Amino acid sequence: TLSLQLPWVEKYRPQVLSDIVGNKETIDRLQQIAKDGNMPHMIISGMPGIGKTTSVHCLAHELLGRSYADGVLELNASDDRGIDVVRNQIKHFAQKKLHLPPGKHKIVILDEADSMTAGAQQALRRTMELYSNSTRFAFACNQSNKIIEPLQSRCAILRYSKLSDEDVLKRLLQIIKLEDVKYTNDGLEAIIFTAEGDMRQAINNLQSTVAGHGLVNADNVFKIVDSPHPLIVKKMLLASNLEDSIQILRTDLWKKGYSSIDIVTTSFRVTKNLAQVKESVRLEMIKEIGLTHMRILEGVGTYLQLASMLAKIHKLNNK
Amino acid sequence: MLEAKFEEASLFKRIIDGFKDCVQLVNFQCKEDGIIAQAVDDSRVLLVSLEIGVEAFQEYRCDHPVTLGMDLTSLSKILRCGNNTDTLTLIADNTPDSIILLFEDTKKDRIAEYSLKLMDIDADFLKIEELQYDSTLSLPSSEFSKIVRDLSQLSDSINIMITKETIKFVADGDIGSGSVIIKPFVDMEHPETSIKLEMDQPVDLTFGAKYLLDIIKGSSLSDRVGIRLSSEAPALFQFDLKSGFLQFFLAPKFNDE
Amino acid sequence: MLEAKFEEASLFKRIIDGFKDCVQLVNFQCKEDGIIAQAVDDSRVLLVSLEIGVEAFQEYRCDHPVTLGMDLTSLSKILRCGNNTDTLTLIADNTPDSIILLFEDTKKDRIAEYSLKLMDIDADFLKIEELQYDSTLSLPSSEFSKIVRDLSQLSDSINIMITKETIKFVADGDIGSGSVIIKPFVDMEHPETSIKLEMDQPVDLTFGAKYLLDIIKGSSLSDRVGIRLSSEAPALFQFDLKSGFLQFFLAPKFN
Amino acid sequence: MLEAKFEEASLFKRIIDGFKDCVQLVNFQCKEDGIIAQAVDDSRVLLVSLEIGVEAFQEYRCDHPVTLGMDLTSLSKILRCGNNTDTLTLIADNTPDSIILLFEDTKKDRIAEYSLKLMDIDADFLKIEELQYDSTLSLPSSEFSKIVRDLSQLSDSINIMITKETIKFVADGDIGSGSVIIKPFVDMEHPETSIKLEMDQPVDLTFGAKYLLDIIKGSSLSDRVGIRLSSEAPALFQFDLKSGFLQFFLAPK
Amino acid sequence: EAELLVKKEEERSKKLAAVVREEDKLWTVKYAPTNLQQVCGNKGSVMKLKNWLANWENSKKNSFKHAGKDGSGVFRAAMLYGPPGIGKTTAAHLVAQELGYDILEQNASDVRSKTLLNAGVKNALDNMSVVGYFKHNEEAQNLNGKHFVIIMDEVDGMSGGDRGGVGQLAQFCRKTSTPLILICNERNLPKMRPFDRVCLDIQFRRPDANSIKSRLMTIAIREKFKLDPNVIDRLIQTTRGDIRQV
DNA sequence: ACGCGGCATTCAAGGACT
DNA sequence: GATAAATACAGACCTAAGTCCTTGAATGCCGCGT
DNA sequence: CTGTATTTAT
Numbered sequence A: 001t002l003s004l005q006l007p008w009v010e011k012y013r014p015q016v017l018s019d020i021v022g023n024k025e026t027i028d029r030l031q032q033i034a035k036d037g038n039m040p041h042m043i044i045s046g047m048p049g050i051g052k053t054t055s056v057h058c059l060a061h062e063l064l065g066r067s068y069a070d071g072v073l074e075l076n077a078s079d080d081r082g083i084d085v086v087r088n089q090i091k092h093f094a095q096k097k098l099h100l101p102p103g104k105h106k107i108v109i110l111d112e113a114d115s116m117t118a119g120a121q122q123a124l125r126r127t128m129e130l131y132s133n134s135t136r137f138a139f140a141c142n143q144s145n146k147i148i149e150p151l152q153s154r155c156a157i158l159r160y161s162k163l164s165d166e167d168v169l170k171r172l173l174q175i176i177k178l179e180d181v182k183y184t185n186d187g188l189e190a191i192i193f194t195a196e197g198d199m200r201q202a203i204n205n206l207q208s209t210v211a212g213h214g215l216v217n218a219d220n221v222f223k224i225v226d227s228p229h230p231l232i233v234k235k236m237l238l239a240s241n242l243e244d245s246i247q248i249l250r251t252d253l254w255k256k257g258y259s260s261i262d263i264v265t266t267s268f269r270v271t272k273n274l275a276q277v278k279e280s281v282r283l284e285m286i287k288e289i290g291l292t293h294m295r296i297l298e299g300v301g302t303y304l305q306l307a308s309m310l311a312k313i314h315k316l317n318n319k
Numbered sequence B: 001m002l003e004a005k006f007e008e009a010s011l012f013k014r015i016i017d018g019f020k021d022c023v024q025l026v027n028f029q030c031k032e033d034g035i036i037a038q039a040v041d042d043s044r045v046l047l048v049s050l051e052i053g054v055e056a057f058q059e060y061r062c063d064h065p066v067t068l069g070m071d072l073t074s075l076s077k078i079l080r081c082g083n084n085t086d087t088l089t090l091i092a093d094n095t096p097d098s099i100i101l102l103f104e105d106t107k108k109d110r111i112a113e114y115s116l117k118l119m120d121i122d123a124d125f126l127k128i129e130e131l132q133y134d135s136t137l138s139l140p141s142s143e144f145s146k147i148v149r150d151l152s153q154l155s156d157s158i159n160i161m162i163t164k165e166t167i168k169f170v171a172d173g174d175i176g177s178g179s180v181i182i183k184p185f186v187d188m189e190h191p192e193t194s195i196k197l198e199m200d201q202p203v204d205l206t207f208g209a210k211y212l213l214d215i216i217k218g219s220s221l222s223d224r225v226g227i228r229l230s231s232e233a234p235a236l237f238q239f240d241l242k243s244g245f246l247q248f249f250l251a252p253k254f255n256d257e
Numbered sequence C: 001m002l003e004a005k006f007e008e009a010s011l012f013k014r015i016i017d018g019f020k021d022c023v024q025l026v027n028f029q030c031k032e033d034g035i036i037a038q039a040v041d042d043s044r045v046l047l048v049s050l051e052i053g054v055e056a057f058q059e060y061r062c063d064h065p066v067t068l069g070m071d072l073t074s075l076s077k078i079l080r081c082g083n084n085t086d087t088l089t090l091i092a093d094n095t096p097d098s099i100i101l102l103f104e105d106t107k108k109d110r111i112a113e114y115s116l117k118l119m120d121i122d123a124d125f126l127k128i129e130e131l132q133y134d135s136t137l138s139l140p141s142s143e144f145s146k147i148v149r150d151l152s153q154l155s156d157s158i159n160i161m162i163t164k165e166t167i168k169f170v171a172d173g174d175i176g177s178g179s180v181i182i183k184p185f186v187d188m189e190h191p192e193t194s195i196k197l198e199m200d201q202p203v204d205l206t207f208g209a210k211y212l213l214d215i216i217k218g219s220s221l222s223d224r225v226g227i228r229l230s231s232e233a234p235a236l237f238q239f240d241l242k243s244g245f246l247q248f249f250l251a252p253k254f255n
Numbered sequence D: 001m002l003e004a005k006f007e008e009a010s011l012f013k014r015i016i017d018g019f020k021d022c023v024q025l026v027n028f029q030c031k032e033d034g035i036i037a038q039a040v041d042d043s044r045v046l047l048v049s050l051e052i053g054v055e056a057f058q059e060y061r062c063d064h065p066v067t068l069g070m071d072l073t074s075l076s077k078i079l080r081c082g083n084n085t086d087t088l089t090l091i092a093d094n095t096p097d098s099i100i101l102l103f104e105d106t107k108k109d110r111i112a113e114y115s116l117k118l119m120d121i122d123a124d125f126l127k128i129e130e131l132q133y134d135s136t137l138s139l140p141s142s143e144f145s146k147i148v149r150d151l152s153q154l155s156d157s158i159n160i161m162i163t164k165e166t167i168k169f170v171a172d173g174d175i176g177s178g179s180v181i182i183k184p185f186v187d188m189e190h191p192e193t194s195i196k197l198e199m200d201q202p203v204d205l206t207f208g209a210k211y212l213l214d215i216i217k218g219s220s221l222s223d224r225v226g227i228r229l230s231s232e233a234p235a236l237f238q239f240d241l242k243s244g245f246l247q248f249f250l251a252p253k
Numbered sequence E: 001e002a003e004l005l006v007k008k009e010e011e012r013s014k015k016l017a018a019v020v021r022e023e024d025k026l027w028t029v030k031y032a033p034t035n036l037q038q039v040c041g042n043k044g045s046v047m048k049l050k051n052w053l054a055n056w057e058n059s060k061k062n063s064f065k066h067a068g069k070d071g072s073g074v075f076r077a078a079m080l081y082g083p084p085g086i087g088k089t090t091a092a093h094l095v096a097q098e099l100g101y102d103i104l105e106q107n108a109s110d111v112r113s114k115t116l117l118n119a120g121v122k123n124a125l126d127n128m129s130v131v132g133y134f135k136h137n138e139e140a141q142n143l144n145g146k147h148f149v150i151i152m153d154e155v156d157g158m159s160g161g162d163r164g165g166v167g168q169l170a171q172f173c174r175k176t177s178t179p180l181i182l183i184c185n186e187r188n189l190p191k192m193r194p195f196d197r198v199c200l201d202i203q204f205r206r207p208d209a210n211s212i213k214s215r216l217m218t219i220a221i222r223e224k225f226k227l228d229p230n231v232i233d234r235l236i237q238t239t240r241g242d243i244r245q246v
Numbered sequence F: 001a002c003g004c005g006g007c008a009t010t011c012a013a014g015g016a017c018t
Numbered sequence G: 001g002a003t004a005a006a007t008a009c010a011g012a013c014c015t016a017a018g019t020c021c022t023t024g025a026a027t028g029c030c031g032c033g034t
Numbered sequence H: 001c002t003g004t005a006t007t008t009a010t
């Protein structure tokens, strides 16, 4: 078909701050700031798909009213991460004179701010303070650690958290009711489980299920969206017997098409994040997994090395 | 509001080209006499004062005094956008946020309107008071620009030693040194080439090189430079216009021992 | 075999310089009617369609259809190795490989033989669609290039609007905005300076500054450029040569 | 002491611009019979030798021979300090401390004075061996510079062939090939637009593109360049001034 | 202090009756210290810097060979370094304002190349202030009105290497005729090595919560929000001595 | 024709890599 | 005024490696003015 | 950790 329909993530992107479901304290604080005015400098950080860009965009829209065209400067940090940007474009926008409602000021939105280079970030330090009376900067990034500490000092540290299953279920139910989709409770629960708090993943998976099969049922959602790799990897690592681990590997990972490097990397990540196993045993399994990773990266990527790694882990656990 | 129509756009183009390499932001005070403007250099060593009277404008109309904060690079680009023979009309509305430059040619019916967003510059309108100058000097502008450009290669300092009926410029640098001596002479045949000297007291002063380059960058404005010296006060460098001038107030070096 | 001779060796120089920056890979296919060249930019935003005719060549001979592919960066380098007062000769064997360029002047006996290795470019679609565009205008190339280069400094997007005997180029950016208004006028004293515009429906679309600046590099070929516009159709930037034409098919932006 | 009144500052300007990007520090050996200047690059491939005679000066007087070390870029900065309708005067004391450059103008009301501080550089011996060359040709400097700049694009190795009254320049690159063929021609209507090929033995030599580009920088001095080829000796690249010569001895690979 | 701020606001309102509204400004800039008696913590560093900048002229008359009683008379340039947000820039601005010098502020992160820094700051080192001369030179209370104090902020962001200007400024600051106040965040950096022996190091430390208790209580009383001093220590510990962030 | 004047392009040094 | 609490803070910074990225300096060609 | 520096307390 020549034309396409808009995705549900962008078509149903919240246009007001109330539609945002998660992080109730932060959303209420941003709504109070929007009503009262005098927006402070901030960095918004968290996981992908929990509503950081949407929150800042709704805040800017509501704060600036009809003046969003001029008062808002949109600059994807990854696209424009040079000191030249700060020297010319950001500085000229900050020195720009614009008549606004009393409380409100001009807003700079720098999405994906974690990718800004050191030079541009350091140059922004004085632009943040010199033109603060007229210009207010806003930062959105996946990881706040990439942003230098002095820049974090000048702004409010507003930190987001992974979306709870209840809020994702509420948003999914709202979209389902609005667009008349047939669903089952098991299917919605499975979509929430696969999303793992990423609302964007949940909505994309709902779109895929609806378009492909037409009914939101557990069977369809599992065929169209596979079970999360770390869970099968953890089940393989935490099996009681060696033969069980070998069987889980052969069936779920090797025969299904997962690569050796992916398997070993996910095993390392799961092992480092495991909590039931004591730290010493966890560390020695990490050692064995790292040896297997070294062999795979040197070029020996085979079922034999993965089985040997499982055998070493089981020997380590069996004392 | 304000509707100021220039006879020609090349005049404003050359004027803005005169002092865009020294100061980046200027406040244009548009009053019933005309547009007086002064802005401090970023190094706070040079001050540029510009006035253009109503006589320059074909039709100048102002309702209320307003401030025009502009960026020199953007203004230079906009004037570059227009042709030489157009009549440039500056139009501003109430509570100005942008300036509507109006290049228009009477020969054709082409009309080009460029809107320059007004920059918000906060600076004090420091007052300027004249004082008695020991040395008032006028030279051909081309020779002045040439000698400054020549000595600036050797060093970053220009030393103006006006001895009795003598004008000596000395530059001392790491690799070589240069000295130029100019003798006052007046020619009745060509008034432009003639050199005039007034010396109440002798003055010896040293000035920065890059500021002097930025000063002589305004050579296109006037054929004759207006140079006035005071030992403890900034030296006024003036380029005379039909209805105004381009003042340059430069700070000297420290004359240690 | 192909033996194409230019009386003005600088003509092919100017044609290649017109679209050297736009594209690097072009298929110069030579037939009996003349050389036809077509190429697409890496971003796939501009289509270049060159059509040289036999009238341009002093002596043109093409035994069989042949497809000669080359790199514009190297070919332009080859062309800058010739003086103004020379005659170019394009030579290609029966099997297309290692095209030979000959810069010869007979007033002072000098010979300049240069070669360029051919390349296998698979894309040989060779399709252009003739459409009844909503508006067809013609203006001097110098004026259009001046307007484009003057408005490209304000922003990266230039908007062209066609209305009843009014042509407007609008560019709104971060430092400000600007709009140039011109009208179709006919001057009997100097026909070259006149501006024509035949409009059927109002036209409103925006183009990119980089591609427009790349297109206006072709102003060195012809003194007048014809521009045809239509609703959601590729803008046709046509430079007419003595024997043929050079057309730039621009794709507008999305509203 | 040394007193040299040059005919025009522009002439010495071109002599300096002949070898701007070639060497950085040189020592001008000043004697009664003109001035000599020799320089050797860091790659040990070219030998710049500059000889200008007394007849090239309007007035030249030097009782005591003096070594005059100077820096090229600062010397050019000094040269970029006078009008092209001015005459140059080089005046120095016996102490090698600073070199005084005097700009004299026809109107006696405009005088310019400049100085150049000397630097000490270990000079190299004179390479004036006149070994026999197989072939000798002379062509205008502008055409040769155009050919060199044109063929330097294809490849960084220049092939020059002279055999049976033919002059060839070949530059085989990765993208294609280049071959410029020129025959010797003598023109009565204009002497400078003539090619004088005097061959005694065939020559097949390979030369570096960058060094050739450096040599063709001296095209502003003379309308023609005299170039001599030898298969066992470095080729000579000579530009003929009013009463002097600028020479490059490029050692082929 | 809350009552004093209310009186100041009332005087400002009367003056306006006779341009940015106060509530528009952020709390960091609206409660910025206007005099050196309001800076919290690092009192010794402020006193030492004030004494150095006051005796700079006397050391200049002595040609900087003599160190003096305090010892801050042999160094031409001074460096203020510490954790971010503790008040180095405010202290430098305030000591410059009190003693009457003309403040010239340059952001080294914005201007880090050799060319721009070289030209600008070089022609700034040995030049008087046209703003200082035209700013009522007639009264003789402030002789230092002519001269410049170049407070170069964000010195830690200059380009490194010989081509970088961070090593050039080391050669630059020893030959200057005006006071230089460099400010950086990470003094112990490889790029900042040329600066140990050419600058008067001044280590601004993290202020203790007791000093900022009064300031926080004042800004809490003014803004009509209730603050208990028991949680102020936890706020400072969480924020790690950063007054701006708290 | 002949010389500067910005502006595009090429070169070189520093930092980072989970 | 000296000696204890009470605590913030400095101890130090390398050479290679492959490839991408950025920033400033040095470089080139090309348009305008005289 | 150990050693040095600064501010409030005895």
Ligand SMILES: Nc1ncnc2c1ncn2[C@@H]1O[C@H](COP(=O)(O)OP(=O)(O)OP(O)(O)=S)[C@@H](O)[C@H]1O
Pocket: A150, A153, E027, E028, E029, E031, E032, E033, E038, E039, E040, E041, E083, E084, E085, E086, E087, E088, E089, E090, E091, E154, E184, E185, E207, E215, E243, E244
């Ligand atoms: N000691 C202090 N007492 C009171 N307010 C302070 C203090 N330190 C910082 N502030 C506040 O924080 C604002 C900014 O202070 P700055 O001096 O800019 O911080 P900084 O120490 O320079 O760190 P930077 O700017 O990240 S390098 C001031 O305007 C004050 O409002």
Ligand SMILES: Nc1ncnc2c1ncn2[C@@H]1O[C@H](COP(=O)(O)OP(=O)(O)O)[C@@H](O)[C@H]1O
Pocket: A008, A009, A010, A012, A013, A014, A019, A020, A021, A022, A047, A048, A049, A050, A051, A052, A053, A054, A055, A163, A171, A199, A200
């Ligand atoms: N808390 C939320 N409430 C409602 N929708 C959300 C929420 N978080 C994310 N979304 C949906 O995800 C889409 C894109 O999320 P986005 O805000 O870009 O993620 P990120 O915060 O990682 O940038 C939006 O269209 C929005 O509909």
Ligand SMILES: [Mg+2]
Pocket: A052, A053, A111, A112, A140
């Ligand atoms: Mg986002």
Ligand SMILES: [Mg+2]
Pocket: E088, E089, E153, E154, E183
């Ligand atoms: Mg600071």
